[PDB]
């Protein structure tokens, strides 16, 4: 079934590869090759985790947990029960990740829009590959990265960020969240804005954009504009996610003690080091 | 237990939230249509919402939505298959007829009123104070198409008087007329504008205003509808 | 060509605004253009609007700023390569445990504090009056407001509402860069790890959501700009091919899809959800639950 506007949209074109094969829709989905890709990708792996349930021995989705090889591994394959199973699984990801952007980048073409949608995604996937193949690479072992299941993925958060003491001291951490808190307090506004527009007091008019940058501008002296506003939540996010996957490459790797002592530097600067007096003299 | 009591009673409101929200974003293209425009048979698990109406301002009306759903005007497409789910073929030429991604709708054909009643978007010559602060000013640069030919020149920037804001180009073209180009579609060069998504042969195509000093919704949608559908079909002459 | 930055700006007469309700007598003069800003969002700066409420909220602010920074002179000893050395470092600390919820503490050992306390929930609370003053001026809806008070409750919830009911001031966080990082961490090891409060771990879901939302619509609103996507409130009341366009992007890829107002419901909602959820989850802890990691071993 189709929105009422849809049907002039389904035209046939924009595929990247396999020309007309599988130009097509299921139901509201597109498919295109990518889509076939990512079927296979998927499914694949959602087996394998159904699987090496088995081997681990449970069927609870809280306790259901696809641990990777351990650290003796190195970067080498493993037997499926212990290490070979996750490994598969994060390929049959990445493929998923990776045809379901370039999915995106089809359905694009088809409707004549912007790749804003695909190159933003692509942050996430740079991110989740940060942790389960670039640091895990330059740290020289697959064992480094996050294990799949619900709990035990936050059992490993906990555990890599004490293994460097208050982990809120890695300094590119404090850049992420800062952006991550931005970016939520700008999606509420824009969100609230927006609908105080749309939304007047009973019986009133909707009001206009002229309106809107009116009353940002009486509370707080500044309007960023509509256009703006859609340009810095897309900026703020992908900052967040930019910072988040720095703040994790460079933790075991080029900084490995506990993130506190980093801040020495700024102490130990010659020009205030040895003055007494303060907190740290 | 009281944290029991709240996160039990916390999922009860967040599926009540989803559900509520579900049926907001359905105050648009529903019902679901088959590919002849007759109703689906699944609707899906979420009902219409019962109506809002939105009261427009200046005098323009209202909008009651959810509402009956109506193209209002003729899609030259047809089935390329005898079953559901296939690409539809355009019947004529796709660019002229609006459909793909050179589609547009049929917004209202009168223009955009800023918040105190004037046209939202004028040709900066009749703006009064309006100017160019800052970047390369195009008025008066060549524009080439993707065929790298040149197929007019640019005589005046359209700007959105109350966002300030640059939104056309208008450029005159060989035989003295002129088109809108979307801003977002075109790039400023030192020497040039370039328009990568029409060949230069397709820049009289474009669809015209009727009046040389104001533009409606409905216009913008032709000419920002014609120049997207270009990226596909002027693919051919994009060397 | 993206959209990300404008290729050309635009000037004409400084925009002053609509006037609906409001009394102009409190607004400003225009501020300066920034050129810079204007490569982004909007070049104009000003006016402001500034009644007998923001000057309230801006005096105490600055208050409250102003008695955190009196008391890191003190503590570097008033010697300002000190003060930038240690900046980090210094902390108004609240009251201890023995004064419970007294006002009887000295100024050098929580007195300052709550001192500073004062000032920031009277800025607070009449920046968010102001919030719903201003929409009313203007006929607008309260979202702002009722958006706003949502960040509101997880601030009141971490420095009045817990403390109170823990029996002191104590309990509050401390002004301070350093000093208030310690503090969250320390409150997860004393409530028995934070990753097992369900409230906690919905609202991560919200605040990671946050991102994927604003980035799906960022993008989605961008990539629709080519047909005057950002015109929201016009695409609202009137619906353009680039509304259908982002409808069906997300549509083809994802199965379902919103509209141009109904997004902004979404976004609304799984913003504010961050805080609502996480001021619960806050609330609970050790008025109700002293270790999270127990409370999940019995479900409850
Ligand atoms: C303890 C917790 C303490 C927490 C304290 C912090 C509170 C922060 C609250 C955040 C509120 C943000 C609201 C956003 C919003 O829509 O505001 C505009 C909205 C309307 O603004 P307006 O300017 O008056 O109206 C302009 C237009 O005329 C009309 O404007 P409009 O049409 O755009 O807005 C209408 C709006 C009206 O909005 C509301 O009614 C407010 C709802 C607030 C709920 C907050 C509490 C939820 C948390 C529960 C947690 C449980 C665990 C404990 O409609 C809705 O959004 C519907 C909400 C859907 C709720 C789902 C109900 C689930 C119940 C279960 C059903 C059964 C399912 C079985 C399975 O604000 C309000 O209605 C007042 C809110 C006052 C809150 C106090
Ligand atoms: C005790 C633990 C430590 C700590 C240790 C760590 C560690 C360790 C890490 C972080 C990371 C992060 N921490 Mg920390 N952190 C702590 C305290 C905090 C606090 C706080 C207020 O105290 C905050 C706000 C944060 C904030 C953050 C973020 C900056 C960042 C997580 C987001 C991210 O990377 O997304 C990126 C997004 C992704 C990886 C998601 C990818 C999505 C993929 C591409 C798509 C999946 C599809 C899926 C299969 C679904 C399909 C099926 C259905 C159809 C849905 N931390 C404490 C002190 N923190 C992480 C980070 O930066 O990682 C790079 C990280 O590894
Ligand atoms: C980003 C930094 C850390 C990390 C730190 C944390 C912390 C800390 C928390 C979570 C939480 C969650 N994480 Mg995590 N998480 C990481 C990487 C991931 C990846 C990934 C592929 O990289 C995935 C899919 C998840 C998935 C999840 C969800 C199970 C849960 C809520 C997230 C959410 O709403 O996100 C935003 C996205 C949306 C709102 C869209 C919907 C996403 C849905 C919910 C994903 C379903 C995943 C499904 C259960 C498993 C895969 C399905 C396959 C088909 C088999 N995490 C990295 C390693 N994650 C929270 C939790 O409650 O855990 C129990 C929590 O507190
Ligand atoms: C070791 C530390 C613990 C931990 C301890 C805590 C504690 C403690 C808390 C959180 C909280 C949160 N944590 Mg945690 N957290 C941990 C691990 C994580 C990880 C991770 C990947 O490991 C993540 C992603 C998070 C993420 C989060 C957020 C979802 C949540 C805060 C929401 C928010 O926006 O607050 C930011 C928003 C505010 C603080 C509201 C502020 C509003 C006021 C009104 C603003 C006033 C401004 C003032 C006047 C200044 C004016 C400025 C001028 C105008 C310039 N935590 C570990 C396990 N976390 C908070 C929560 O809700 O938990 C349930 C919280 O209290
Ligand atoms: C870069 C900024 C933010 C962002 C952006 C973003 N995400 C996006 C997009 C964009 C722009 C999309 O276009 C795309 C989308 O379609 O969204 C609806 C997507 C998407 N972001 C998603 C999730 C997601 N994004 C996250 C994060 C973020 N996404 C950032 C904060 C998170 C977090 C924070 O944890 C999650 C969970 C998906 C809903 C969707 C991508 C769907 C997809 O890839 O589908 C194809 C793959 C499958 C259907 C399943 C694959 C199954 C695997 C083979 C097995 C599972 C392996 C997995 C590693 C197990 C992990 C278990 C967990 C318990 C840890
Ligand atoms: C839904 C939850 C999210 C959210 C929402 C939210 N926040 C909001 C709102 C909303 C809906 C508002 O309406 C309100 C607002 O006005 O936003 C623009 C606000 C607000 N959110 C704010 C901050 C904020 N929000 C946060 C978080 C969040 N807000 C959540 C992520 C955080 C975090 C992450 O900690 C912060 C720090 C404020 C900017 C603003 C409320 C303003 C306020 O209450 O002010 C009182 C104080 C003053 C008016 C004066 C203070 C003076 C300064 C302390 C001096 C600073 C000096 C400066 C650093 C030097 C430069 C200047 C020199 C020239 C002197
Ligand atoms: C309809 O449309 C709409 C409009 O238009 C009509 C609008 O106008 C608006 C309103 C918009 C505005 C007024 C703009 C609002 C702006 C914001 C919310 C803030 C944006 C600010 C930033 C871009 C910066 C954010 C990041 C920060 C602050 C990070 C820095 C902070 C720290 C303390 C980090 C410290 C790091 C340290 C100390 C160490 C690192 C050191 C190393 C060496 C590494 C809305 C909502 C809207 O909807
Ligand atoms: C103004 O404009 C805009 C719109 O429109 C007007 C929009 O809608 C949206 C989109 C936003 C929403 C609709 C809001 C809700 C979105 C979220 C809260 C984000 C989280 C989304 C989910 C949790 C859903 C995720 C579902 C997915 C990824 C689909 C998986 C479902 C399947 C059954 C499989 C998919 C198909 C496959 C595997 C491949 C191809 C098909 C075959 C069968 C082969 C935005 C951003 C926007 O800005
Ligand atoms: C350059 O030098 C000068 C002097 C010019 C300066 O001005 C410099 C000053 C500084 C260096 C200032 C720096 C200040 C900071 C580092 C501030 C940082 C603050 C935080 C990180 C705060 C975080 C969290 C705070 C919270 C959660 C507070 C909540 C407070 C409340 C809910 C209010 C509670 C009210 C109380 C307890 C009083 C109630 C009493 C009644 C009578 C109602
Ligand atoms: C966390 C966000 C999850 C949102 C899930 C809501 C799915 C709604 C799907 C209904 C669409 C029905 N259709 C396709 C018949 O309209
Ligand atoms: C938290 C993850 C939830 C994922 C739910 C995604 C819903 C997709 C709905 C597609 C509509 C399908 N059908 C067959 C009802 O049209
Ligand atoms: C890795 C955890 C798998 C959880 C399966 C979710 C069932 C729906
Ligand atoms: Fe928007």
Redesign the interface.
Known sequence: ??????????????TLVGG?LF????????VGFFGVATFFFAALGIILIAWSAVLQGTWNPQLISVYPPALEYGLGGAPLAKGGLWQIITICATGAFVSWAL??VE???????????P???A??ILAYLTLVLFRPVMMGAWGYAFPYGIWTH?DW??NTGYTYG?F??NPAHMIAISF??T???????????????????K?????????????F??????????????????????S??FFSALCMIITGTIWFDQWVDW?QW??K?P???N??????? | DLASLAIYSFWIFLAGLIYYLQTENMREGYPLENEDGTPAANQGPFPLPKPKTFILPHGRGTLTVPGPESEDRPIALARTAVSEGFPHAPTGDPMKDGVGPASWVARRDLPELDGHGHNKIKPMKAAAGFHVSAGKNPIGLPVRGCDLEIAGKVVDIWVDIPEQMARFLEVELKDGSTRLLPMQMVKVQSNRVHVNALSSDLFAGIPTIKSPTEVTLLEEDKICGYVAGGLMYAAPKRK | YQNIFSQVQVRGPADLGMTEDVNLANRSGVGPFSTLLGWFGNAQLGPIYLGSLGVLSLFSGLMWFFTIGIWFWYQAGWNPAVFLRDLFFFSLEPPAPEYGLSFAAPLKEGGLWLIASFFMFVAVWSWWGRTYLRAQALGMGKHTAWAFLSAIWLWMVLGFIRPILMGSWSEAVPYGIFSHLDWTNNFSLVHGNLFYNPFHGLSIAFLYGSALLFAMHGATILAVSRFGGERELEQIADRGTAAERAALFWRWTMGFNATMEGIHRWAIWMAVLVTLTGGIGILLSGTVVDNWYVWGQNHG
């Not at chain 1, 019986?203 to 009353?215: A, L, N, S, Y």
């Not at chain 1, 003055?275 to 003299?281: F, L, M, Q």
């Open positions: 079934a189709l929105l009422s506007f849809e049907r002039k949209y389904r035209v046939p074109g924009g007309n130009d097509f829709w299921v139901g509201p989905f597109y999915r995106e359905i694009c073409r088809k409707l004549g829009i912007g790749y804003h949608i190159f933003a995604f942050f996430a936050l958060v906990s208050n809120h001291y991550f808190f970016n939520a307090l700008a999606l509420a506004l824009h969100g609230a804005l927006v609908l105080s527009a749309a939304n007047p007091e019986g009133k008019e909707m009001r206009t954009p002229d309106h809107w940058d009116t009353f501008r009486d509370l707080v002296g500044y309007s960023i504009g509509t256009l703006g506003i859609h340009r810095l939540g897309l900026l703020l996010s992908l967040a996610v801040w700024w102490v600067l020009w205030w080091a003055i007494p007096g303060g907190i740290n003299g």
